[PDB]
């Protein structure tokens, strides 16, 4: 185990990619909540 396995660099990418769509999803909501706010802002 103390040695790097023959393959894994792909897993490296897999890990970060998760974070990608991850943090991405959260920000999506932030803007989403903001969007209704703006739509409401538009109404007022």
């Amino acid at each position: 185990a103390r040695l790097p396995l023959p393959m894994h660099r792909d897993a490296r990418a897999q890990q970060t990619a998760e974070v990608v769509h991850a943090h991405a999803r959260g920000a999506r909501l932030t803007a989403a909540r903001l969007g209704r706010a703006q739509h409401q802002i538009n109404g007022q």
């Binding site: 959260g26 932030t30 909540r33 903001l34 706010a37 802002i41």
Partner: peptide, 11 residues
Amino acid sequence: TPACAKALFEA
């Protein structure tokens, strides 16, 4: 994230 929540509350 907390700052964003505060901004949403202000809005």
